[PDB]
């Protein structure tokens, strides 16, 4: 929402069992809500001590390996599970299917505040890396890079540049540093205009049909595949209200009795895995929160993408 004064780069973090189930309709890379909740956890744990405000994540995903397996004779896939403990009686517990995946992402945390001036850049970069080393990103532990070739350090890029050329130089230097991955942005205006063209073709078509049409490899007869611009994916773009907002000590069995609970439901927007130098400014492509809590509509996106 606001512009970051600096752009921190947490380097390639190895996540071993992330959540492959991003949403009820999407499997694969975990939801960007996990990464925005991670940067809010980082702000809640060391952001208040350094007098900075870590907002926004650029999700890069150098490596992804889902713990899946294609069954024999089926085109679809199934998830490799774990073995839960037995019950108190000795029988096998009722299995619940949780998708696990191995990640390697690097995060662009947009850091703005009055703590960039108090501390050096390398100190606050090192302290948020040490705080991220004892955390988890989507349910999966962050592997801490022991006894390898060399440890990947951080770089807090002060985005306030003296010139346009030095700014473009350090943006290119950072893009070369997070290069083999694929930045994730939220392209929802493309989904809405594809819904507009779909409704032009056939009326009363809703945007779930436009989302599914942007998802699949659909064929057209003269046979030619309808082309897709980029790697468009369905992503859960936040939540939506189902119940009115309850009081803190009102709902039963909540997490805490001091925070208002509201029953919610996902909102599957459209995302687009694009390469990091297709953006020409890394102060875009960061994932912020947008709540508007009177209406529901607790959503996350990349504002200022285009």
């Amino acid at each position: 929402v606001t512009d970051p004064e600096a752009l921190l780069l947490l380097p390639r973090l190895s996540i071993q069992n992330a959540n492959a189930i991003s949403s009820p309709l999407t499997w694969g890379f975990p939801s960007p809500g996990a990464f925005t909740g991670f940067v809010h956890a980082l702000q809640r744990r060391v952001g208040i001590s350094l007098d900075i405000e870590l907002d926004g994540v650029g999700i890069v995903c150098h490596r992804f390996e889902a713990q899946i397996s294609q069954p024999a004779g089926k085109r679809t896939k199934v998830f490799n599970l774990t073995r839960n403990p037995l019950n108190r009686d000795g029988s096998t517990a009722a299995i619940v299917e949780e998708g696990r995946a191995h990640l390697e992402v690097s995060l662009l945390l947009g850091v703005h505040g009055d703590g960039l001036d108090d501390h050096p850049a390398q100190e606050i970069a090192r302290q948020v890396q040490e705080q991220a080393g004892a955390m988890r990103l989507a349910g999966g532990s962050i592997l801490p890079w022991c006894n390898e070739r060399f440890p990947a350090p951080n770089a807090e890029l002060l985005m306030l540049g003296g010139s346009d050329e030095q700014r473009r130089k350090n943006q290119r230097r950072l893009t070369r540093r997070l290069l083999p991955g694929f930045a994730l942005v939220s392209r929802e205006a493309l989904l809405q205009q594809h819904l507009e063209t779909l409704r032009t073709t056939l009326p009363e078509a809703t945007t779930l049909d436009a989302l599914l049409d942007l998802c699949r490899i659909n064929f057209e007869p003269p046979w030619q595949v309808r082309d897709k611009p980029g790697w468009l994916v369905p992503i859960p773009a936040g939540y939506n209200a189902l119940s009115p907002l309850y009081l803190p000590g009102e709902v039963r069995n909540a997490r805490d009795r001091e925070t208002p609970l509201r029953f919610v439901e996902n909102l599957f927007g459209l995302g687009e895995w694009l390469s990091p130098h297709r953006v020409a400014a890394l102060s875009d492509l960061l994932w912020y929160h947008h709540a508007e809590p009177d209406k529901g509509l607790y959503r996350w996106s990349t504002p200022r993408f285009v």
Partner: protein
Amino acid sequence: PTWQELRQFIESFIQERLQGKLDKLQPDEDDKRQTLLATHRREAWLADAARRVGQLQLVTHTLKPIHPDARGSNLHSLPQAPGQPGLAGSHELGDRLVSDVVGNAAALDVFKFLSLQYQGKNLLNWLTEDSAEALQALSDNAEQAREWRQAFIGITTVKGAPASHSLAKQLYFPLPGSGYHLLAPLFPTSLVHHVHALLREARFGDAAKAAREARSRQESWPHGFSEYPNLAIQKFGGTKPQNISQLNNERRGENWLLPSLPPNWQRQNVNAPMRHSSVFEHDFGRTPEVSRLTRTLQRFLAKTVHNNLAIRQRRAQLVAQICDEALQYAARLRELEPGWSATPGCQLHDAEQLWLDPLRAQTDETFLQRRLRGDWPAEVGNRFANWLNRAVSSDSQILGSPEAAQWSQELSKELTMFKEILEDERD
């Protein structure tokens, strides 16, 4: 719209239930027909059915797919539409709600009774709008009719205080000012059933199987078809998917998740050229994706002008994706493998000098690093332009027209940005 036809329709449903019970009774003695015709025939069937409603619940967002030892709250609530454009889910269903049932499966006759389609709509939807046709048929006294109507309407209400079990999910959300909201999400099962119906119609439907066979005939069909690759199946009940919900009997588990995958979700291993034949076959090292991308550029030859505008924007996008995949191939080859400085030979295409960035500088300090920083090897783009001239054919309908000018200008600006990205490998 009159109460007499609704009355006789309800009596016909009750009598069909009793006739099915008597036909599947296999009785000859014990006089159970008297008790069955006293209970399951009269308007006391409405009485014990209205007693049975509190065992059921019409739901749209169940909890039980989240870990099935969870006794929380299940909601039949449709969200309001976001004013923000783009994103949507489960509020698009206006007249296509499938409307799951949770609760005691022994009381499913109440839901089958409220789901009869008597005039033009459900009996339940007749009971929500209090009319003359409603609340006159299901009794002769309006007091117990009002009581049974209030019972039947309660099939879509939350029973008890709102709750979410310790095994359920509930997630803090940072508000703009301060504070959080707990946000316990519920599994949208009517939306999952709708997307599951769309996916089953597009995969196993007859109108898609016909076009799929017409593709194998190589003939012409009116409509096309979809494919939906990389779907993952998630079943909710382990061995008993009956114990989750109503529609989880129809889709036996089987959530059918769409793929949200990054493009490097298939690990490609790295290979550097060793010998002269390896340097002739591995100078390019062309992945399946760039061949899939150049085959699309090969299908972008012919054009009419109003289509050639979008075709030129698509050709610019494809050359951008090819150049960017070349940049990522150079990136992962220069970073992952030390094989560019593994062995010496006679032919390794040493004019490239881009896929061996740390290989010739971090070991040789003044030998090749002084031949890469002052020379700044960026002549790889001129050799890379030969690949994209091989991607296009010899079509003279564009070579003797202004399409070659637009092609050359987009190629020049794209090799310009490829050159300035390739220029500063030294920093």
